[PDB]
Amino acid sequence: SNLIEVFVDGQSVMVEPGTTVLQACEKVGMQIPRFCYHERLSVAGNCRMCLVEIEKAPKVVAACAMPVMKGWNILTNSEKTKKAREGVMEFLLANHPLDCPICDQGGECDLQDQSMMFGSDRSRFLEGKRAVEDKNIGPLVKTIMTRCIQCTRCIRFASEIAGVDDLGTTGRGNDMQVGTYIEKMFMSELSGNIIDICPVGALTSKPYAFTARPWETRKTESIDVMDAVGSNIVVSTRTGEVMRILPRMHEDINEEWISDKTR
Amino acid sequence: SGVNNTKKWKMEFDTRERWENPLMGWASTADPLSNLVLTFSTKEDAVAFAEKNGWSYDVEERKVPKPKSKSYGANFSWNKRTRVSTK
Amino acid sequence: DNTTYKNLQHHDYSTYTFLDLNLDLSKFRMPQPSSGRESPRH
Amino acid sequence: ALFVHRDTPENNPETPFDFTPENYKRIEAIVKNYPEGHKAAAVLPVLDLAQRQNGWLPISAMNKVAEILQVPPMRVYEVATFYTMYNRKPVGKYHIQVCTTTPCMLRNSDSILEAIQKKLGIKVGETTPDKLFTLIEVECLGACVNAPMVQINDNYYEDLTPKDIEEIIDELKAGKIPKPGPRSGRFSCEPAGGLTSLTEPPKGPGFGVQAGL
Amino acid sequence: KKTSFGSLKDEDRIFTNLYGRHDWRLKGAQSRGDWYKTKEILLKGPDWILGEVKTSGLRGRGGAGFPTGLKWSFMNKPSDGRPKYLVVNADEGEPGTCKDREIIRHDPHKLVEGCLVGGRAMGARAAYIYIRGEFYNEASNLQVAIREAYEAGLIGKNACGSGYDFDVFVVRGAGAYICGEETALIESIEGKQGKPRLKPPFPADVGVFGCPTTVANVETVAVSPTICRRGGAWFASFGRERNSGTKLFNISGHVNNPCTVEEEMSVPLKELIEKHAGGVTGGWDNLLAVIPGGSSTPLIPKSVCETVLMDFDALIQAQTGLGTAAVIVMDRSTDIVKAIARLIEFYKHESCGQCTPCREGVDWMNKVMARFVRGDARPAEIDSLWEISKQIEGHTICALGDGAAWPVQGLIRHFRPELEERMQQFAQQHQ
Ligand SMILES: Cc1cc2nc3c(=O)[nH]c(=O)nc-3n(C[C@H](O)[C@H](O)[C@H](O)COP(=O)(O)O)c2cc1C
Ligand code: SF4
Ligand code: SF4
Ligand code: SF4
Ligand code: FES
Ligand code: FES
Ligand SMILES: [K+]
């Protein structure tokens, strides 16, 4: 009825009003690069990795936050779009630490994978890097905060999903730091989910630390039994040993979260 | 967040015993199908392959994420709870 | 006269001058609107 | 300048702080400025009030502000660390803030900064032993035509020379309050040596008012 | 029409107490024509007031120059049940700019009446005046003027006897140049970090407290009472077409008499410096470069300054911008590289850190610029620096990222030999 027509790379798609540019692209099977955006968190628009060109429009728009307009043609592979991604990736990697060999995220890192797919193949940053101090938020989540890319996913999850306003940002500019300011533990019954949403190895699982790499684990799709909710999980095993538990998306049960006891 | 590994259908078999090699402690197996994974374009293709090979199978419906209503302006609501306390 | 400075009152302003003025202005203000709840967390 | 709090004997959640009964009346006026259901709008003025009462913001002062307004303490910490006018460490009785941005840099704000350093004997970012002065550099203070300028607490001292600032500091040590404003002949932002404009009596009411009201 | 501009008469000047010679309180302001027939203006209704501002050609004095009448008209729509607000941007943070400081402390009643006249045209119930926290005395003057207006019946319940209820609140910032950005300012009023919002939504739809809002510069608001009193056509009779009216100019830096003055739009840049500011230090031939509109606008060399007119369109043709019309003058004794490097250091200190290209990019440019000051770099890095700034520009949430890329582009565009000449000098002393 009220569907409006937009185009993705010239292909017409009908979407409801209020659909974002990022959502319009999904309907034709394209995934826009992202870091700060998460479909179950409030829109942020800060990482700028989703910038995309609208045809015959001088400025690129943040695909995650921009509602589509009737007749828009979204050029998701244009030279302007591709050069926006390369610039943003370059800024993300400027201060990032050369940690991949010792970082648990290695092999299942969105920063690694989107650098490979959408970024340049080399560096022209000739300066020294930022280094941030680490923060203790309890025994379940390890924080190597020099890896943080300031996407604020953890802050939005802590506030909106767990209902806890303990995480935030302090300072500003290049020195803006995610944390609790004071020495405080983040020990919600849902706290372990900030490990999953964090796109980098800034927040990692303390119990899982260093034990395995992603490519070598076999994934068994199973069901949690720590409660009567029936959360869908993936058991990760390696060489006949259970290594970790991850959530498995089920919209009508656990969405994509699990409790700390399950995890 | 990438969704490119959720595009195709897979066929895998039931997991069987893995035990520790006495010499080195490696994980030993007597199951020839432990690593056998097959890719299919559609559910029908996978079922047809299992029927003609005689294997008992369980099929599971594809889980597609629900469409969400996203609104950046909801972060600044005049009177709703969606108003955020930090950016 | 156009030869002398006439903004010398702030020479005798103090720490609470601005907030004292805000407090004294409170009686002239209109009733505030309400969003219907004590806060976004209610 | 660290943006993480570490408890100390003098700065910990049990450090005594509370608004005086008079500052509670002022806080009532502040809160009434904003729509009902949006008390969080008062966070900046109430934090600033606590600084005016206390001289700086201990973690207990931030926790007090959060409690009054029913906002999470983290949302008060974010404001406290975002805005540079909030002092999360004690400062001298006189906070000297020397502008060093380019327009003041062009008018020799370095000579002013070195003159203060040489006199008080403290490098930028330090406090004097008697705890009367704290010296820092700041960005443009919105008084560029009157450069080089400094701000001591709530007052601006402008069109300065190394001699002028040493004179001001001497008055502060003596306990006198020096007069804010230009230390050259002029009064505010007029051109020196005579007005090139507004040399006529200002016109009166209803001058050039268009027909039709 | 008019071919030359400038040499404005005192009778046509709006801020007739710019230098604070005459009394700044209610008595003095009324003697200068303020608060005159304000009742009549209010009863003319929002459409007429908006027509006055549309006809006058007023463009935003905050640094972006949007046509005000069109902008304010976004609020001229039926209510949705939410209150509507006017926010006056008095953050006054742009380096080199210090004109709103004079209006707030010497002509406060023009602003207060501006809030009422501008507020009525938007159907706003109140005006929130955001003022930088450093202007403590200036914000105290403004509160006396507001209190006088309340006690004289000029604002408040049944303002000016017009039957319209309007309030004026003053809100002080706490040290953040980013809080002059319109959405960052709105966030600060709500008690959050001064972090700009993405657009849409636009403030006229969702603004302060989530309500329809308009943010207007102090200078833009403070002139709308006179544009209505004296007529929009009178205002449009100054300056070139689409660059109408008078304008407050700050001339600072290497001039003999740094000052704030009001002049006609499209006045020649050379005329403005020489007539009011007493000329460049060491004479005109000593001029090296000028930043014509605050730190954000790219510099321009002496040759361009010979004939360039001071208005929005003329400065765009010179690959710069009018900005806030804060003229920073640099003579040949200046270290042009260091002067710009200190400007990048300013933006590095002011970035809110919210979005990636400015959080990491501006700091990156600051380090490169610092090295360019000593020549501890290679010429191939200049084009790298140019590319980096283009990656920041147009890819950030707000215009601070653009404002930190333009000064770098201006330096590279006009003083590349100076950069390459410093690198060559550094290299030889290190062999
Ligand atoms: C970093 C930054 C700082 C700004 N600072 C100010 C300021 O101090 N005063 C101001 O009026 N506008 C400032 N602006 C411009 C505002 O965002 C906005 O365009 C202006 O307030 C609109 O008012 P106007 O249309 O009446 O000019 C700033 C913009 C940016 C990006
Ligand atoms: S977060 Fe990703 S890119 Fe960064 S060190 Fe870890 S694996 Fe490498
Ligand atoms: S810790 Fe991870 S999730 Fe949180 S802001 Fe940093 S990168 Fe984002
Ligand atoms: S461009 Fe800079 S100041 Fe503007 S939102 Fe991004 S980080 Fe903040
Ligand atoms: S995914 Fe859109 S800006 Fe981060
Ligand atoms: S540059 Fe120093 S007050 Fe503006
Ligand atoms: K992670």
β-strand pairing of E326-331 with B9-12? unpaired
Token pair of E176, please?
């953040």
Provide the CA A201 distance to its chain's centre, in angstroms.
Answer: 11
- Say yes or no: CB of residue A103 within 6 Å of ligand 2: yes
Interface membership of B87 toward E (CB under 8 Å):
yes
Is residue D56 within 8 Å of residue D90, measured between CB atoms? Answer: yes
Å between A113 CA and nearest CA of chain B: 9
With tokens 């408890």, the residue in question is D7
Which of A125, A201, D134, A96 lies closest to E356 in space, CA to CA?
A96
Helix (H, G, I), strand (E, B) or coil at E57: coil
Report the distance separating Cα A133 and Cα A178, nearest Å: 11
Pairing assessment for the beta strands E156-159 and E164-172 based on DSSP bridges = antiparallel
Looking at beta carbons, which residues of chain B come within 8 Å of A249? 63, 65
How far apart, in whole angstroms, are the C-alpha atoms of residue D4 and residue A106? 28
Backbone angles phi, psi at E100, to 5 degrees: -65, -20
Token digits for D139? 């960005």
- Rounded Cα distance, E410 and E49, in Å: 40
Spatial contact of A93 and A115, defined as CB atoms under 8 Å apart: yes
Q: Where are the beta strands (DSSP E) in E95-230?
A: 126-131, 156-159, 164-172, 213-217
- Ligand 3: residue whose CA is nearest its atom 2: A198
- Which segments of E318-430 are extended strands (E)? 326-331
Atom of ligand 3 nearest to the CA of A167: 4
A111 C-alpha to ligand 5 centroid (Å): 13
Distance A142 CA to ligand 2 centre (A): 14
Distance of residue D184 Cα from the nearest chain B Cα, in angstroms: 45
Angle at C25 between CA C20 and CA C28, to 5 degrees: 160
- For the domain E26-237, what is the CATH code? 3.40.50.11540
Give every CB contact of residue E396 below 8 A, 6+ residues apart in sequence.
A48, E355, E357, E358, E402
Q: Side-chain half-sphere of E405: how many Cα atoms within 13 Å?
A: 23
- Gap from D208 CA to chain E (nearest CA, Å): 6
Paired tokens of D140: 């443009």
> What is the rounded CA–CA span in Å between residue A52 and residue D131?
55
Strands A11-15 and A4-8: antiparallel
Token output for E78:
């039926």
Q: How far apart are the first and last CA of chain A?
A: 44
Three-state SS letters, E162-186: CCEEEEEEEEECCCCHHHHCHHHHH
Which tokens hold the place of A36? 């700060």
CA angle in degrees (0–180, nearest 5) for E96-E179-C15: 85
Residue E220: CB atoms within 10 Å: 23
Binding-site residues of A for [2Fe-2S] cluster, in ranges, read 36, 47, 50, 64
DSSP-derived secondary structure for E242-266: TS-SEEEEEEEESBSS-EEEEEETT
The amino acid at residue D121 is: G
Q: Are E357 and A45 in contact (CB < 8 Å)?
A: no
CB E82 within 8 A of CB E206: no
CB D113 within 8 A of CB D124: yes
Residues 6+ apart with CB under 8 A from A208: A104, A243, A244
Cβ proximity of E335 and E303 under 8 Å: no
Q: For residue A184, which phi and psi values (nearest 5 degrees)?
A: -150, 145
Resolution of the determined structure in angstroms stands at: 2.4
Amino acid type, A33:
P
Which residue on chain D is closest to B77 by alpha carbon?
A: D38
Asked if residue E178 has its Cβ within 6 Å of ligand 4, the reply is: yes
Dist. CA A50–CA E141, nearest whole Å = 47
Instruction: Let me know how long chain E is.
Output: 431
CA angle E198, E199, E202 (to 5 degrees): 130
Whole-number Å distance between alpha carbons of E197 and E203: 10
A212 lines ligand 3 (CB under 6 A): no
Tokens standing for residue B70: 């996203």
> What H or E segment, with its residue span, contains residue A236?
strand A232-237
C-alpha A4 chain-centroid distance:
29
Task: Give the type of residue at E323.
Answer: G
Q: Quote the CA–CA distance of E157 and E150 in Å, as a whole number.
A: 9
DSSP-derived 3-state class of residue A181: coil
On chain A, the residues whose CB falls within 8 A of the CB of D81 are: 170-172, 181
Contacts of B1 in chain A (CB under 8 A): 31, 34, 38, 110, 199
> CA-to-CA distance for A92 and A103, rounded, in angstroms?
17
- Identify the DSSP state of E398: S
Place of tokens 């007052």: D155
Contact between E386 and E412 (Cβ < 8 Å): yes
**Ligand 3 mean position, distance from CA A43 (Å):** 15
- Would the CA dihedral through E140, E142, E143, E148 be positive or negative? positive
- Copy the structure tokens of residue D116: 């203060």
> Which pair of tokens denotes residue E37?
């027939």
Q: What share of chain A is helix, strand, coil (3-state, %, to 5)?
A: 20, 20, 60
Residue with tokens 């409660």: A227
Look at residue B63 and give its three-state secondary structure: coil
Nearest to E171 by CA among E138, E118, E211, E128: E128
Q: Which residue has the tokens 């950030």?
A: E396
Q: 3-state SS string over A11-77?
A: EEEEECCCCEHHHHHHCCCCCCCCCCCCCCCCCCCCCCCCEEEECCCCCCEECCCCECCCCCEEECC
Contact E18, E246 (CB under 8 A): no
Residue A214 one-letter amino acid = P
DSSP H helices in E191-258: 218-230, 232-236
Distances from the Cα of E361 to the Cα of A91, A92, A132, E344, angstroms: 6, 9, 18, 11
Per DSSP, what are the bridge partners of residue A12?
Answer: A7
- D34 and chain A in contact, CB less than 8 A: no
For residue E426 the two structure tokens come to 């550094």
Which residues in chain E have their CB less than 8 angstroms from residue D106's CB?
Answer: 252-254, 328, 330, 334, 339
Closest CA to A177 of A160, A195, A152, A197: A152
Which residues have C-beta within 8 Å of that of residue E430, sequence separation ≥ 6? none
Residues D142, E92: contact at Cβ < 8 Å? yes
Compute the radius of gyration of chain A from its Cα atoms: 20
Q: How far apart are CA D35 and CA D47, in angstroms?
A: 19
| Neighbour subunits, D (≥3 Cβ pairs < 8 A) | A, B, C, E
b vs e for A166-186, b when ≥16 Cβ sit within 10 Å of the residue's Cβ? bbbbbbbbbbbbbbbbbebeb
Q: Is the CB of E14 under 6 A from ligand 1?
A: no
State the smallest CA–CA distance between residue D193 and chain E in angstroms. 8
CB count in 10 Å sphere of residue E119: 30
Partner residues linked to E263 by β-bridges: E247
Alpha helices of A95-148 — where are they, by DSSP H? Answer: 110-118
Report whether residue D45 contacts ligand 6, using a CB cutoff of 6 Å.
no
Whether E309 contacts E266, CB under 8 Å: yes
Amino acid residing at D123 = K
Q: Compute how many other C-beta atoms are within 10 angstroms of the C-beta atom of residue E134.
A: 29
Which residues of chain E are at the A interface, by a Cβ-Cβ cutoff of 8 Å?
176, 178, 193, 198, 200, 348-357, 359-364, 367-368, 381, 384, 390-392, 394-397
Q: Do A165 and B70 lie within an 8 Å CB cutoff?
A: no
* Residue A160 near residue A188, CB atoms below 8 Å: no
Would you call E251 exposed, middle or buried from its count of C-beta atoms within 10 A (0-12, 13-18, 19+)?
Answer: buried
Q: How many CA atoms lie within 13 A of E41 on its CB side?
A: 34
Q: At what angle do helices D43-54 and D59-69 cross, to 10 degrees?
A: 140
**Does C31 contact E at CB distance below 8 Å?**
no
Phi-psi region of A181 (alpha: psi -120 to 50; beta: other; left: phi over 0): left
Question: What does the DSSP assignment read for B7-47?
Answer: SSEEEE-----EEE-TTT--EEE--TTTT-EEEESSHHHHH
- Number of cross-chain residue pairs from B and E with Cβ atoms under 8 Å apart: 30
E353 lines ligand 4 (CB under 6 A): yes
CA of E90 to the centre of ligand 1 (A): 9
Q: Which residues contact E179 (CB under 8 A, 6 or more apart)?
A: E91, E93, E130, E132, E173, E185, E188, E194
Spatial separation of the C-alpha atoms in residues D165 and D157, rounded to whole Å = 8
Cα-based distances in Å from C13 to C10, D170, E140: 5, 21, 8
Pairing mode, if any, of strands A141-143 and A168-170?
unpaired
Whether the CB-CB separation of E363 and A174 falls below 8 Å is answered with yes
Exposure string for E398-413, b = 16+ CB within 10 A, e = fewer: bbbbbbbbbbbbbbbe
Beta pairing, strands B27-29 & B18-20: antiparallel
Chain E residues with beta carbon closer than 8 angstroms to that of A45:
198, 355, 397
Question: In Å, how far are B70, D84, D153, E139 from E132, measured between CA atoms?
Answer: 35, 12, 14, 9
**E45-E49-E50-E52 Cα dihedral, nearest 10 degrees:** 150
Say which residue the tokens 């606008």 belong to: E297
In a 3-state reduction of DSSP, which class is residue A150?
coil
Please count the other Cβ atoms lying within 10 Å of the Cβ belonging to residue A102: 11
C-alpha to C-alpha distance for E101 and D180, rounded to whole angstroms: 15
Q: How far is CA A139 from CA A142, A187, A204, A207, in A?
A: 7, 9, 11, 8
List all chains that touch chain E, counting a touch as 3 or more CB pairs closer than 8 Å: A, B, C, D
Closest CA in chain B for residue A66? B72
Closest-CA residue of B relative to C35 is B79
For A66, other C-beta atoms within 10 Å of its C-beta total 25
Beta-carbon count within 10 A of C32 CB: 17
Can you state the percent helix, strand and coil of chain E, rounding each to 5? 45, 15, 35
Contacts for D141 with CB less than 8 Å, ≥ 6 apart: D97, D99, D149, D151, D156, E134
Rounded Cα gap, residues E234 and E227, in angstroms = 8
A34 touches chain B (CB under 8 A): yes
Residue A260 makes CB contacts below 8 A (sequence gap 6+) with A140, A188, A189, A190, A191, A192
Nearest Cα to Cα of residue D46 among D127, D37, D25: D25
Q: A170 vs chain D: nearest CA distance in angstroms?
A: 5
The Cα–Cα gap between E40 and A11 comes to 57
- Taking Cα atoms as reference points, which of A201, A190, A211 lies closest to residue A256? A190
Q: CA A51 to CA E270: how far, in whole Å?
A: 42
Asked if E70 contacts E197 with a C-beta cutoff of 8 angstroms, the reply is no
Q: Cβ(E365) to ligand 4 under 6 A? A: no
Distances (CA, A) of D64 to D37, D49, D169: 19, 12, 35
Provide the 8-state DSSP code for E395. Answer: S
Q: Kindly calculate the radius of gyration of chain D based on its CA atoms and give it in whole angstroms.
A: 22
DSSP-assigned beta bridge partners for residue E287: E331
For chain C, the helix, strand and coil percentages under 3-state DSSP, each to the nearest 5:
40, 0, 60
E308 lines ligand 4 (CB under 6 A): no
Minimal Cβ distance to E395: which of A84, A150, A176: A84
In sequence order, what are the residues at sequence separation of 6 or more whose Cβ sits closer than 8 angstroms to the Cβ of residue C35?
A: B78, B79, D35, D36, D37, D38, E209
Q: How many Å apart are CA A62 and CA D99, to the nearest integer? A: 37
CA E96 – CA E63 distance, rounded (Å):
12
B10 to chain D, minimum CA–CA distance in Å? 47
Which stretches of E306-418 are assigned E, i.e. beta strand?
Answer: 309-310, 326-331
Question: What's the DSSP call for residue E86?
Answer: E
Report how far residue B13's alpha carbon sits from residue B36's, in angstroms, rounded to the nearest whole number.
7
Cβ count within 10 A of residue D69: 21
The residue written with tokens 């040759």 in the block is E303
Check: CB of residue A208 under 8 Å from CB of residue A243. Answer: yes
Helix (H) or strand (E) holding E300: strand E300-301
* CA dist., res. D78 & res. D3, Å (int): 9
**Shortest CA distance to D165 belongs to which of D213, D82, D104, D208?**
D104
Sheet strands (E) in C1-42 = none
How many angstroms separate the CA atoms of D25 and E301, rounded? 56
CA nearest to E154, candidates E115, E104, E100: E115
Strands of the sheet with A232-237, listed across from one edge: A218-223, A232-237, A242-247
Single-letter amino acid code for the residue at A179: G
Q: Which of E53, E71, E88, E94 is the best mutation target for the ligand 1 pocket, counting ligand atoms within 8 Å of the beta carbon and taking the most?
A: E94
Structure tokens at E106: 């010497």
Q: At residue C13, what is the residue type?
A: Y
A249 vs B: CB within 8 A: yes
Please check whether residue A166 is in contact with residue A184, taking contact to mean a CB–CB distance below 8 angstroms.
Answer: yes
Question: Tokens standing for D161?
Answer: 């020379």
Tell me if D35 sits within 8 A of C35, measured CB to CB: yes
